[PDB]
Symmetry: D2
Amino acid sequence: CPLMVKVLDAVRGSPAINVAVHVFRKAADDTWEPFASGKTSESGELHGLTTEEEFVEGIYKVEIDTKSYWKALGISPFHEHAEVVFTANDSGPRRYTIAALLSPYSYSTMAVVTNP
Amino acid sequence: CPLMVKVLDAVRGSPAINVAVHVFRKAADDTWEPFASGKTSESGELHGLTTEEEFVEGIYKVEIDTKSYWKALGISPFHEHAEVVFTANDSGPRRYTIAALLSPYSYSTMAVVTNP
Amino acid sequence: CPLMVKVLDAVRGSPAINVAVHVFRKAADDTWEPFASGKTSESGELHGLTTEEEFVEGIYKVEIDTKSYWKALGISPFHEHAEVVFTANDSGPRRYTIAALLSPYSYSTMAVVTNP
Amino acid sequence: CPLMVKVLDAVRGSPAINVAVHVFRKAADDTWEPFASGKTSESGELHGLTTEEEFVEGIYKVEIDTKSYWKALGISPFHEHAEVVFTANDSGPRRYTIAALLSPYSYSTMAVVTNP
């Protein structure tokens, strides 16, 4: 559990279920290499993306596919996706929870970072 | 205009128009006394609530009638209203903008305090 | 667990620990009667406030004592407290998670409502 | 002015001044091509990015240099930058305001889309 993503739906007051999430890591040649992906569960949470060993220092991008979520609810949202870009593990291994609260024309995102 | 209120609708990506706003000031006996009120304009803003002379240091509450706003859109909301409670402090010249971003099950509020 | 409160600190990227929370329920004479209170744990969470039996239909106010939290960190925040006011259980018993994300001049609050 | 960006600082309750903002438009080959850029004004706003003629339908990215903003205040931030990605749609006349509310470990963004 060094990386967990949680997504909530501010319209329904619920977890955002079946939201696709793609994680990327910046490579040596400055491109975004695919790192891990998954979908949020019935709790709005996505666990198991990576391991402590694999989640090395680097610049990571978490891309939450909000448009597809809204569209399947009948809403035409503003954003294509929510993107969260951050340096990880640069002072040693940490645990990151990336949370997103979604509305059709707005989101917020928060990171909780803990040292195990 | 030392106090302005702005209300935005995160479902429709618009100003929140015709929202009732009530301002109170905490009295000596610790009750909330009516101070100012109005309805947001087409821009989601409510100007002209008070004056520099009248807006003395004290504890204020801004109550925003969110429930009625959502009910008029046919959307079931969580909150009865949104409440913003703060102390006004003389600390050189100051203007307060209270912003609220509304979703059915969530709101965020921000205060922007500036000196012209 | 019909009522849980979670508080996060957007400055530190952490749970907001030792935050006082007071819950009130609107009485028959339209006053706010004390209902329950507590403090957030090391996880930022406050569990055990009430029981399914005691948490009847009504209008509830959750008052999160944000000012005192900030002040003990050396920050002079804007708000006195964050207040969350809502009708509960009016279509039968539900479980409510009230979350707050705190910054010195801003907060957001979200409710997750589930039917057990 | 079909596109305006506003950036606010939730730690200090102020406009976020002198923040670099870069706008990109998605090209045919799926890369992000520079489109407009500037730095926020004393009001936290960036006006004059584009024109109605130039701002055709397409996918845009607004990148806000949050990290440099926080570093200048001596505050350690989580994100590399804040990114807002959206489709511009002709649907009668329209003006887009992209707002971002910044905290060290969190941001929220809102789009206000209006027709004069």
